[PDB]
Symmetry: C2
Subunit: 114 residues, 2 copies
């Protein structure tokens, strides 16, 4: 028994989208904030973020831009796009539909048992 | 490209099917019928999609099958499958707690 590999990836995706929903961010800052928000229990691998962010950018869910150039830097920031905001709405609504189906399955089982 | 991607659609169907079996052992035509009724007639899942998913779940030991007393082939959630659903529920709750803490810091 274990959390399957696909579900771990889905959980990381979900967390990252919510981080960017809070505000634009960079990879090292995201990792640090998630570690703090998990009381040290969730230490995201930067390689994992690079893989996920490549996919999300391909799908138009996030975009990127350079920051810190005025200070002599060149750091990649990520932001949730309007398409990304809609994707998060659709994810919430579609999982709500799934929950409703499962609620009806349970209710239909009680009805028949009676 | 806002639509629900194939991976999340697969996760949604997986969750529905595992919850059917958690409620009780069942055979494929009965599962499809119950999901159709629970979706107000709108979701009549195609058998092939279900067999694709069941192939993976059976290979991973999450479900098994046996004959009833022609005979119907019944599927059951295994003890590992039940534990997996508990572990998934708890891991997603930790995810929710992380997001609550992330939101509090923004606030």
């Amino acid at each position: 028994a274990e959390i399957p590999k696909e579900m771990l990836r889905a959980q990381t995706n979900f967390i990252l989208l919510n981080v960017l929903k809070q505000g634009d961010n960079y990879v090292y800052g995201i990792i640090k904030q998630v570690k703090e928000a998990s009381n040290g229990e969730m230490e995201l691998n930067e390689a994992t973020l690079y893989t996920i962010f490549k996919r999300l950018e391909k799908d138009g869910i996030i975009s990127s831009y350079w920051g810190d150039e005025s200070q002599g830097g060149r750091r990649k920031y990520y932001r949730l796009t309007e398409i990304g905001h809609e994707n998060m709405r659709l994810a919430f609504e579609s999982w709500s539909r799934v929950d409703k189906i499962i609620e009806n399955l349970e209710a239909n089982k009680k009805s028949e048992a009676i």
